[PDB]
């Protein structure tokens, strides 16, 4: 970290302690050139990454939007709410594993599709019909044929 | 009617015309105090037969249940809200024409399918996949073959 | 209004009453052919047109965005909140008077500048500096010259 | 740092990198038990002199009041958030170099103007129009003249 006083590039960590019930790291740093001392805080970014929509508008990640889309596709299917919640938790872990501040809605959609393939193939076709915006009934056959290769 | 802008107690009807295939009256009103103009719609509020559900439980006719089911199927389809409202008016009209105190769920779903077959074929498949509760992915092709056959 | 029972094109209004604290008109209509009676409700359409942004993205009309921009321009200016609210009401009235489903944000901006020119000329220049996205300081004098005519 | 997901006590720092033009440390941390990965930011928290407002009331130094004013002036200007954060860090460094327990509002305003003069001249005029509370439109030209005289 650069010194906030003289802007020398190397600062030394002289002390460290956990704060905020172990969720943050409070440090004491010392400038090697101007010898000034200062406090720093290390805080995690726990909020989910923002979503870049199809029209390039950014909006905060909305877990209810993700879930309600899956529940429309899973209508009348033999998938428990625990299976859906585990699938949502897996999608959320993958989004966080990217390390990105923002992720395109296309990444969320692709991740939902993979979970739906494992959970219920009828639900997968229903979701794909909207996510891939089918304009002709021919597209159902094409999506099914693709699924039948794997 | 009171002015929705300045809350003056009387408004003058400046223009009137039949809309919704003669089922509604669209009016243009003008406030005599603030001179603002606005549009109003006059719609009938009729008694609808009760709905006998698949499990034989009776429940009142719920126009929102009818509408939301259609809108799920019509996602991203080029059908206007006016086309949907005309389809809903036609469905409600047919249920009323039976003269029955109650009508089965199946009759409503069947009537919706007739409308969706005229409005959008992709919507028809999406609705049929839930209404006819598809269990295998091959049921999409079979519904397509049947749809194209009538 | 057409009869919802026999579909005769003629129904006579036999009674009228204000409901919803004067905001709606309840009518009792009678078909001249089948003599059946039914109730109707007349309600106003208070929907501000959607906004077409500079990048062609549509978004609902947001009164707070409109006001927030004017209050930035009016900082430290002798214009009362009543003057601002009357200016906002006038802008909303003009957008509604277009009869359009959607209006470009450019129309909203032009309308706010028209109000700001009447309210406070300093505010007008401040708003124009962002609305017209000034890239050089010479644009302030250029905007003043344009105003110091009409 | 403790894992914010499973609450295991010692997350491993798997990556570290300077951000915000060297003023902050971005870390990537991994829990050794649940294997979840998350991002953290290390930022300095410095003691700052109190602010003596125009009415002689003292109030603690509020970085957000300083930043939000600059961001209003920098609207639609080609200045990155890193340039803004470096300007604020420079302001903070200069206020600390005075050694003063309290500093007048006027000193902060003048220091912001010196940074805005380097970052963007349009932003400088916008800020000056409110900071120097322009009462008439000729003050814009007068400020542009004093500015173009360095
Ligand atoms: N804000 C959000 N938070 C979480 N999931 C989202 C969000 N917006 C969309 N999703 C999900 O992202 C996936 C892709 O959505 P999709 O509708 O294709 O994208 P979009 O950017 O919303 N485009 P469009 O609907 O065409 O305007 C679906 O699983 C959505 O439910
Ligand atoms: N109370 C209701 N009023 C109006 N339409 C309804 C009502 N209940 C269901 N519908 C519609 O009737 C059609 C058939 O619905 P469907 O789901 O097949 O019937 P159901 O009795 O609800 N059976 P199930 O959902 O399997 O328990 C669809 O268009 C529904 O939206
Ligand atoms: N959704 C909205 N509802 C109401 N007023 C709005 C809305 N969006 C923008 N405005 C106002 O419309 C006027 C023009 O805004 P302007 O910033 O030029 O448009 P824009 O489409 O947002 N472009 P940009 O900001 O460059 O991406 C201003 O008075 C805005 O405050
Ligand atoms: N408490 C504060 N901490 C840090 N910066 C501040 C604070 N208060 C004001 N500023 C900034 O100081 C500069 C001068 O603000 P200015 O508005 O001229 O001062 P003031 O005392 O708030 N006067 P006034 O707003 O007229 O009551 C601007 O950059 C403000 O954003
Ligand atoms: N009728 C449906 N059947 C099956 N899946 C559906 C249906 N409607 C939506 N989904 C699924 C697939 C879509 O890509 C996904 C998201 O739909 P969408 O209506 O775009 O909402 P969203 O969550 O992306 O929010 P937004 O309204 O901001 O676009 O949900
Ligand atoms: N994901 C979907 N895609 C397309 N159409 C759908 C979808 N989900 C529902 N629909 C349509 C077809 C269904 O037969 C119809 C009604 O669905 P359903 O969930 O049973 O509600 P409903 O209106 O019958 O109420 P209830 O909850 O009382 O059963 O809506
Ligand atoms: N610093 C400012 N001084 C004066 N007027 C301003 C200032 N910032 C914004 N405004 C005015 C002029 C702008 O054209 C108008 C709208 O600004 P903008 O930030 O684009 O917001 P908006 O209301 O259009 O929403 P959005 O964030 O969706 O673009 O507000
Ligand atoms: N519309 C604007 N355009 C450009 N810069 C602006 C605008 N509004 C405010 N600023 C800048 C210049 C002002 O001197 C500075 C501070 O504004 P002000 O509203 O006084 O807040 P402040 O940060 O001093 O807090 P306080 O509310 O305590 O006075 O921000
Ligand atoms: Mg979407
Ligand atoms: Mg049902
Ligand atoms: Mg804008
Ligand atoms: Mg102030
Ligand atoms: Zn130093
Ligand atoms: Zn009125
Ligand atoms: Zn009749
Ligand atoms: Zn863990």
Numbering used by the authors:
A (entry chain A), B (entry chain B), C (entry chain C), D (entry chain D): 1 to 150
From the reporting publication:
NrdR is a bacterial transcriptional repressor consisting of a zinc (Zn)‐ribbon domain followed by an ATP‐cone domain. NrdR binds specifically to two “NrdR boxes” upstream of ribonucleotide reductase operons, of which Escherichia coli has three: nrdHIEF, nrdDG and nrdAB, in the last of which we identified a new box. Tetrameric forms of EcoNrdR involve alternating interactions between pairs of Zn‐ribbon domains and ATP‐cones. Our results, in combination with a previous structural and biochemical study, point to highly flexible EcoNrdR structures that, when loaded with the correct nucleotides, adapt to an optimal promoter‐binding conformation.
We present crystal structures of EcoNrdR–ATP–dATP and EcoNrdR–ADP–dATP, which are the first high‐resolution crystal structures of an NrdR. The structures reveal considerable flexibility in relative orientation of ATP‐cones vs Zn‐ribbon domains.
